[PDB]
Structures are given as C-alpha cells and as structure tokens.
Symmetry: D2
Subunit: 267 residues, 4 copies
Amino acid sequence: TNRLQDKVAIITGGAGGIGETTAKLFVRYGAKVVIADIADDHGQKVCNNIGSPDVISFVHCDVTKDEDVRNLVDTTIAKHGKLDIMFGNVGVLSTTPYSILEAGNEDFKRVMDINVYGAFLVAKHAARVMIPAKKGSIVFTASISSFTAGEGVSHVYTATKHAVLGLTTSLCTELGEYGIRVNCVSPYIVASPLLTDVFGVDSSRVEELAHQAANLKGTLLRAEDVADAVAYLAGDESKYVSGLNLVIDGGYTRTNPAFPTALKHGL
Amino acid sequence: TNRLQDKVAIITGGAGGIGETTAKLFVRYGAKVVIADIADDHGQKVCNNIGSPDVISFVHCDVTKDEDVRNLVDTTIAKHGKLDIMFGNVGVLSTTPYSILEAGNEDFKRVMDINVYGAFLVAKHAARVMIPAKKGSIVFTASISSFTAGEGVSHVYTATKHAVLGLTTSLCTELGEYGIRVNCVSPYIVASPLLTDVFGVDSSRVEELAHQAANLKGTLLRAEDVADAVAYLAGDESKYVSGLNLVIDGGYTRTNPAFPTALKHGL
Amino acid sequence: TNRLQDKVAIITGGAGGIGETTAKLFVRYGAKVVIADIADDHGQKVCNNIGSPDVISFVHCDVTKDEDVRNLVDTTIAKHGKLDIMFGNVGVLSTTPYSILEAGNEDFKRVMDINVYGAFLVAKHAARVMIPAKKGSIVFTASISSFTAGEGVSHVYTATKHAVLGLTTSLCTELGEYGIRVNCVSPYIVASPLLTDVFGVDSSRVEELAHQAANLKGTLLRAEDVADAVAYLAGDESKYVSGLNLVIDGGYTRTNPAFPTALKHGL
Amino acid sequence: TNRLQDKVAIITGGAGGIGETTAKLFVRYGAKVVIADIADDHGQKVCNNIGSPDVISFVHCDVTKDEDVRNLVDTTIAKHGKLDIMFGNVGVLSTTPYSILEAGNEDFKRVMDINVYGAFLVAKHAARVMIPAKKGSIVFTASISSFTAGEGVSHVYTATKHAVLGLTTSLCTELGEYGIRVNCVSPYIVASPLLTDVFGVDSSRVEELAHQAANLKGTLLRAEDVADAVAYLAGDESKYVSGLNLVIDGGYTRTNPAFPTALKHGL
Ligand SMILES: NC(=O)c1ccc[n+]([C@@H]2O[C@H](COP(=O)([O-])OP(=O)([O-])OC[C@H]3O[C@@H](n4cnc5c(N)[nH+]cnc54)[C@H](O)[C@@H]3O)[C@@H](O)[C@H]2O)c1
Ligand SMILES: NC(=O)c1ccc[n+]([C@@H]2O[C@H](COP(=O)([O-])OP(=O)([O-])OC[C@H]3O[C@@H](n4cnc5c(N)[nH+]cnc54)[C@H](O)[C@@H]3O)[C@@H](O)[C@H]2O)c1
Ligand SMILES: NC(=O)c1ccc[n+]([C@@H]2O[C@H](COP(=O)([O-])OP(=O)([O-])OC[C@H]3O[C@@H](n4cnc5c(N)[nH+]cnc54)[C@H](O)[C@@H]3O)[C@@H](O)[C@H]2O)c1
Ligand SMILES: NC(=O)c1ccc[n+]([C@@H]2O[C@H](COP(=O)([O-])OP(=O)([O-])OC[C@H]3O[C@@H](n4cnc5c(N)[nH+]cnc54)[C@H](O)[C@@H]3O)[C@@H](O)[C@H]2O)c1
C-alpha cells in the first residue's frame, strides 16, 4: 500500500544519490515531496522524472545559507499546507588529503558549513513549523563515522558527521518534549553510477570493494537500503523511537580483524 | 498490505504482553507464527484468539532448557517448511530487592538462566536452521538498561539485559558473514492490563508515571510500538541493518535533569 | 615525587580555571609549562604566580586563528627544546538561549570557531612537532555533553563538545600509528570563585547544586579533580591508553531518575 | 614516592599475569596486598616473591563460590583493619570453539560462573565492607570485548566481559551514592611468558602479532601497562571518576581497515 500516506516531506539533498531513491520511495509510499538542492539541472531532472509536481517539486537551496533554508520551508507550507517530515541528508567530504599535517585549514570551514552548521538551519526551519503542530520526525543522515573512524576519512568529516549526532541527541531533548522525533540514519559505502576523478573510483569497482570488506557477504548496500531506514524513522512506525542512529553497516563497525586476520590459524 | 508475507517467525515469549501484539502484527502482516511459551493456558488463549493455527500455533518451551529449545525449532521446520525470523523476547526481572548488600545470591543464577544463557540457545537453534539457507534476522529484545541504569532496576537485570547485546554484536560478527542479520530491540515502560503485587503497580498508574517521566510528552508507549520496531528489523526493510539496538525510549536515555531541574531559573 | 618530570607542556586555556590548577599540578609534577590564553592580564598573573618562568611562561594566543596557534608552538620549541604534551582545553559556551527556534544563527559560527575548528589547529601545530619525535599525548577537554545532553546546554555546545571527540578518535587513528596518543578528558560542573551575570550564578550556589544533583554524594568536583584525569593521560602512566574520553561525572551520565524518583515507593 | 600509601587492596586473580604486576605495583606504591587465587602453588610463589607478608599474603579463593569470597574479605579486615580497594580481575575464556552451531552448551555456564556471576560476589563482599566506611573504588577488569567483537573471541566471553560493565555502570549507580567508586579497566593482547597448547601460541609470537595488528606502532602492551590504568582508578587520583571503562587498546577499537586496506591507492 502507500504506507506514509498523507505526509509532506522535504529532502535537503535529493538530486544526487541517496536523496532521490529516498524521494521516489516516499512518493511511492504516498507522500508529497519537495526535493531541494543547489544542483539545479539534476534536482529537477529527478523531480521531472519520478512523478508529476503536485507530488514532486524542486527548490534551489544552499544550506550554507539562512535566507535559503527560510525559503524552502516557507514555500512547502505554501505548496502543501504543512511539514510532517524533514529528511536532512546534505553532505560533503574533503577536497584536501587526510593527514593532519598536510591536509589544510579552510576545507574545515567550508565542510563544517555544509555538514554541521548547515544541518542546523534545516532543523531550525523545520522545528519552527513542526512545533506549531506538535507533530514530526526530523531525520538527518550521518555516516558510520558518526560512531567511529578510518585511515581514509578526513578528521573534518569524522568531526562534522559526529556532531550531526550532536544536534540529534540534543535537538532530541527538546524537540521531543513536543512529540516531535529527532533521529538520524548512518550508512556505509553506497552510490556508484560508475564514478572517477582520480581512478580507483570508477564505481562498481567501489561496490565490489564494499563486499570483500563488509561483515555481510550475501548482499550489497544501495540507496533503497538507506531509504528503508528512512521511511521507518519517517512518520509511521517511528512513533516512539526518537532514540536512534540507525547504523547500517551490515554489522561492520563492531569488529577489527587486524588481530584475527593476522591470528588466523594453520599454514 | 501484508508486508512480511511469506515469513515464518517464532516468538520465544508471545503469551504475555509485547510478544502477542508483536505476534498479531506479524500475522496481520502475513507471516505464520509459532508463539512459544511455558505459560500454557495463556499462550494458546492467545494462539486460539489471534488467528487459525495454520498461521498461529503454541509450543511449550522453557528457554532455561536445551531439549526444549531443540523442540520448537525442529517442529517449526515440520509445521511450516522453514525459519526466516526468530524474535527472541524472553524476560524476567528480580524477585529480590536491588541493593547489592541485601539483594541475594541465587536470583542471579535463575535470572541469568532465563535472560542471558537462555537467550543463547534460541540463537543456536535458529542459527543452525537459518545458516543452511543463508537467510534470516534474529531479533532479540533487551531493555534501555542494555545501554544504561537505574536506582530501581537490579544489578542482575542491568547485567543480563546488557549481555543480550553481547551475543547480538558478537553473534552478529559471524551470523552476518552468512547474510543473516543479528539485532535487538530495546524498550522502556510498556505493559499494563492493570497490575499489582505490592501496590504502586495497579497498571495504568505505571503508564501515567511513564509520561511525567519520559522525554516525549504527547504519546504513550505500548506493545504496538515495540512490534513496530520488530517487524522493521524482521525480514523486510531490515535488509542491510544488522547494526542496531533500536532504543525506544522517546529519547529519555540521553539526558539527566538532576542538575537542570535543580538549576531551573526563577522563583 | 615530581612525576612527569622532564615534560614540556602547553595549556591552550590556563588562565581561567581548570587550566591553571592543571598547570600548577604539571609544574608541581616537574614539567615546564607555557600557559596560553587571550586573557592577558589573568594568564600572566597566573604565570607570575605559580612559579618562575623557566618553568612558567604566558603567550597570547587566539585559537580562533592559525598564525596564533603557529606562534605558541614555534616559541615553545624555542623556549624549551621540544613539545611532549598539549593539553587543549579551550571552551566557550552560548550567549544566546537554548531553544532551537529562539536561539540564533551566529553564536554557532563563533562557538564552533573557539571549540571545534579551533581545537583542530592546536592538534595540527602540536601534531607537526610531535610527529618529528615519534612521542606525545594530545589531551583535549570536552564535557559530559561529549557523550549526551541537557535542557540547559545549547544545541551548539552539545554539537561542538561532541566533535572534540571527533578529531580525538579520528585524530587518534593516525597520530597513533606514530606512538603519539590522542585522548580527551570530559568533566561535569566544576569552577566557582563565586560567579554571576544573571543571578542563580553566584558560585558556590552552583557547587551546592552539583551535590543535590550528582551520583556521588560524599565529595565535590574541582579543578584538582580534572588535573588528576589530565596528568594521567599526560605522558606517564598514559603509555598505551590512547582510547579514552575519561568521563568524570562521579557516575551521573548513566542514569535518569525521572522514572525512579517518580516511581519512589511508599507514602 | 609510594603513591597510594595506606591502602589495603585485594586482587581476585593475582597469581597469573596482569594480577601480579598490578600487585607488585600496588606494593611498590605503598599498599598492602592480599593476592587471592585458586592456583595455590603460583599465587604464593608470587606472594613469597614480591615482598614480605605484612604487605603481601595469599588466600585460596574460588569466585565460582560464596563461602569463598566471604573468606578473603573477612580475613583481609582481620589481617589489616580495612578494605579500601578491590581490584577484581578474574577471567576465563572458552574451551570450546567460537562457532554458534559447533561450540557448546556448558562452557557458557562455567564461563559465566567465573566471569559474570562470580565478578558479582567480589563486589558484594567488598560492597558490604566499603559501605560501612563510605570510601572505596571497586575496579574490575574487562576486555575490549566489553565494548565490541571478533572472529576469534567466543560469543560467551563477548557476552560475559560485556556484563562486567553491567554491574559496573549499575553497581555504580548505587555504590556511588556512598562516595564509593565503580570502574573497570578493559585491555587488549597482553601476557606471554612464551605460551602454547595448540601452536601459534608460543608467546612472543602472540606479542609480535599484537604490533602488526594494533593502532600504535612504537610500543607493546604489557601488564605494567594495565597496572597503570589500575592504580589510577585505585584510590588516589581516581577521586571523582566513577565513569570509566578505561579502554587500553592504543586506539585499535575505533577503526576497521577492511575497507581502507582494500581501498589502498596505487599499484
Ligand atoms: N557512499 C555513500 O553514499 C555514503 C556513505 C556514508 C554516508 N553517506 C552520507 O549521505 C549523504 C550524501 O548523499 P549521497 O547520496 O551519498 O551523495 P551526493 O550525491 O553528494 O548527494 C547529496 C547532495 O548534496 C548536494 N549539496 C551539496 N551541498 C549542498 C548545499 N549546500 N545545499 C544543497 N545541496 C547540496 C550535492 O550536490 C548532492 O546533490 C551525506 O550526509 C553523507 O554523509 C553517504
Ligand atoms: N515494560 C515492559 O514491557 C518492558 C520494559 C523494558 C524491557 N522489556 C523487555 O521485554 C521482555 C518481557 O516481555 P513483556 O511483554 O514485557 O513481559 P511478560 O508479560 O513477562 O512477557 C514475556 C513472557 O516470558 C515468559 N517466560 C518466562 N520465562 C520463560 C521461559 N523460561 N520460557 C518461555 N517463556 C517464559 C513469561 O511467562 C511471559 O509470557 C523482556 O525481554 C524485557 O527485558 C519490557
Ligand atoms: N564547570 C566547568 O568548569 C566545566 C564543565 C564541563 C566542561 N568544561 C570544559 O572545560 C573547558 C573550559 O575551561 P573552564 O576552566 O571551565 O573555563 P574558563 O574559565 O572559561 O577557562 C578557559 C579559558 O579559555 C579562554 N579563551 C576563550 N577563548 C579563547 C581563545 N579563542 N583563545 C585562547 N583562550 C581563550 C577563556 O578566557 C579562559 O581563560 C571547556 O573545554 C569546557 O568545555 C568545564
Ligand atoms: N591478553 C591478556 O592478558 C588479556 C586480554 C584482554 C583482557 N584480559 C582480562 O584480564 C583478566 C585475565 O588475567 P590475565 O593475567 O590475562 O590471565 P591469567 O593468567 O588467567 O590470570 C588470571 C587468574 O585467574 C585465575 N582463576 C581462574 N578462575 C579462578 C577462580 N574461579 N577463582 C580465583 N582465581 C581464578 C587463574 O588461575 C589466573 O591465576 C580477565 O578478566 C581477562 O578478561 C586479559
């Protein structure tokens, strides 16, 4: 059936990848979506092809900005008379190395802006429309680096998708005394459609590497798989779980075979 | 629609309370259930009234025992040709005080038996039938004391519904390299139907106390609310989340107003 | 004895409160300190009275800045020929309410600058001098809101002293493959000397409120008590623990008597 | 100097390995110890050679038993007039495989007995002597599997050194409203003196494998390294930290290079 039918939802990043299969799921399950990206020529060739705009519309938004998050929210109330759900994806990763010493100073500012102090506004403009109605789940989207680490992932993405659990445990302790839920989803390597910028990346040869590395040989992750975790937390069937940081790693995050797959046994 | 339709499920405690609304949900969503309790005269006046046994049957089981968990599992394969899901509830709480010093020695043995080294067998007899088919989520059921504490809850229930996350993170790291998921749900004060044994308890005057104490004024918990968290993790829409300890507290676990509601402000 | 004798340490906030009793402890335990604050007229009437500058010197630093963190580090190497320890305190809290809706937009920028993307530089200029020597613990200082929450503490302080565990778990996974440790201490209500700015605060009537609220009636917190946690992690006796977020709450963080001290018993 | 001088301590496992270098440290730092093991002919050729018995004595104890934990505690009060510290090590690991399916049924009973419902009594007989004096830290000793997992470590050791954080967070919430601290230390591969029982183990060729696997190349773990973590938490300098599960992994627990050391870069 169309499961969370009635809901009006806003994805703050539904052009790219997780965001449009999460969109297409929510419009399959009977919501009305407002995709909301800066990537203008993909975010409406996603909203032009998913459905017909009464249910799916686009809005240039730049979360690095307050007048922009103001208008997305104010025109959802005006497109559709309310805002039940605010899936707040948005996320950026470093364009400087890793290494503390030779990895810089200003792709910390900019990748804190898009990820932490830009995930906030989304929650302040949703908060100021959900609080008047005493209903709503604000889902976000972090990564398994909300929990932990990697010698890959930058000290900034480790740091900003950590605090997107900050104001999602704390945002929780007040938007909760209103019967408004605050959760975030928190994935692992997901979205292809055959990459590259430095080679390695030419994706599928990323997805193949997400199976020799996982802790759940049998399947592969996808976006339908995060969309899963997000309609759950969104509206229906989420109704008393404002806890969560629904870690979708297929278990991975809770091992380290550095010493088991060195320990081994016989040879 | 009937959502996890096809599934064969086993509740290891579906007479009592969480367990039969979780049962009635799974049989509403098109599974075939086998309720499985020692409480013989409630567990079949639950299986006699929910549905008709092709979909809902009872089996005396005593998880404190191995020949008993052997036969429940072996007759599910025989009632219905497989075991996709094993919701493993089961849980007991102290019948001695709290206080380390004057709270005893043998309602640690017995309430470790029913809760930790009796949650195990459920997972060893489900494991030995799910591994042959390379499919299945083993959901359990812990409490928010899997995470934390209370000056109420006994050092034994704090201790045994802690380890039901032991062999649910660890059970995970192997029943996972099989595309078998291992999660547990983890609730807060839930089930009435107007209690007592020492007075206080005369339940609803438990549920009323679960609203002046929560961090989500607006609703009240129930069993449909844990059943929610359990069909999610069971089969469909759980397909790459073997992480979780789906904490369903309405946020509660992540505060302490000892110092805020002492701090206050003006008077 | 003078325990971590030899060490050269840098406090990045040792004028104020935790920072100078942690300083006075490190100079009692035989280190040589460089206090390092913007508060010019307190940071040297702390360095002028603790000891004589061969062991205790001041340096205006403004962690909201890179040329400033550059020079503190470069003149420690020049005052004293190395940098074993970098205690990185620094911390600021909101000067806007709490409430998402009416609590603003730019004391998120500024109190992310001093706390997260200003805790970083401290670790990049210490990192670039500890890595050449393959020795050193970078201790930071977070709060129990690194772990959790409060209806008091702002969504920004909840968010920035969360990520000071970001780049302290992640900073760890690389400054660690160098035998350089990365930990942070993480306290609860500490430092008086009889406050006010809005009344309530007139401190001791803060400390008195840190005893009717704690989970360890018997003592009171202090700065010697965090200094404790910090010489431990600093240099000696820290030598294989790069794990920690040494939570010094006297247990507090792991309860919630909303439902126990509502549950009570007899009246 | 002799740091925690005055203290009377009890190790509940100080014959073997961690336990006697932790003993020798506490008697170096001026305590008076009572080692306390079943291994009769090692536990006194440890107490006969460390020091002279006024400071170091042995007592056959079998924590799988209550009359035994009763007498150790009652004769410490009688050897020495009190019990400030109770380091409660004790720990056993499986003598059946790993695999849920073919790994048995009764080395769960026995290795729950020595580890969880035998760590308890230690804390009930220490509790009943520390509570009369309103002073004392009960340190335990868990493993990094208190936090997480491994495809090595058995589902039972994962499960029992998990709950030794149960009744160490919960034991905390009451032995704490007495100014009695409750913490546990929580190590990684430690103690040689050149092993074997199945070959692999012939230890040092265990310790060598604890360096190609760690996240802190530079040093190696030892027992002085856990003794470190335990005098800290014991008595002095522990005075307001009843939080902790002092994870001493050299960072390890918070990564997984399954996907980084598959991701790599160029070849
Ligand atoms: N492999 C994965 O897909 C993966 C792994 C782990 C976590 N995540 C998280 O998932 C989110 C990323 O989505 P995705 O589908 O993976 O990647 P994506 O394709 O980058 O999708 C996100 C969208 O964000 C857009 N965007 C960037 N800045 C702005 C801005 N300021 N305002 C509005 N839109 C903007 C960007 O153009 C894109 O359309 C982030 O929160 C990640 O932390 C993804
Ligand atoms: N307020 C709540 O409902 C609450 C709160 C927090 C956690 N939980 C968890 O939920 C579970 C309890 O279920 P419930 O509905 O609350 O209570 P319940 O009514 O006790 O239901 C559980 C069933 O377990 C049965 N049972 C006990 N021992 C055995 C045994 N050895 N073999 C087979 N059946 C047995 C018991 O008779 C009952 O039918 C436990 O795992 C708790 O830890 C419940
Ligand atoms: N009650 C407590 O003391 C408490 C509670 C919980 C956590 N903490 C943490 O402890 C730290 C605060 O120290 P404190 O002694 O409590 O307070 P404090 O008296 O504010 O000491 C910190 C110092 O930071 C200084 N400072 C501010 N900005 C800068 C800057 N940009 N550059 C250099 N110096 C600057 C400030 O002037 C002061 O001297 C923070 O990291 C808090 O998160 C304290
Ligand atoms: N590699 C390591 O050393 C390692 C790693 C991780 C955790 N730990 C923990 O450290 C503790 C083990 O100590 P250890 O030095 O490694 O090993 P160990 O040499 O086995 O020392 C522990 C002592 O426990 C003794 N013992 C066993 N049962 C009893 C009993 N019932 N009553 C009294 N004494 C008994 C045993 O004979 C031995 O003397 C456990 O709590 C482990 O969980 C150790």
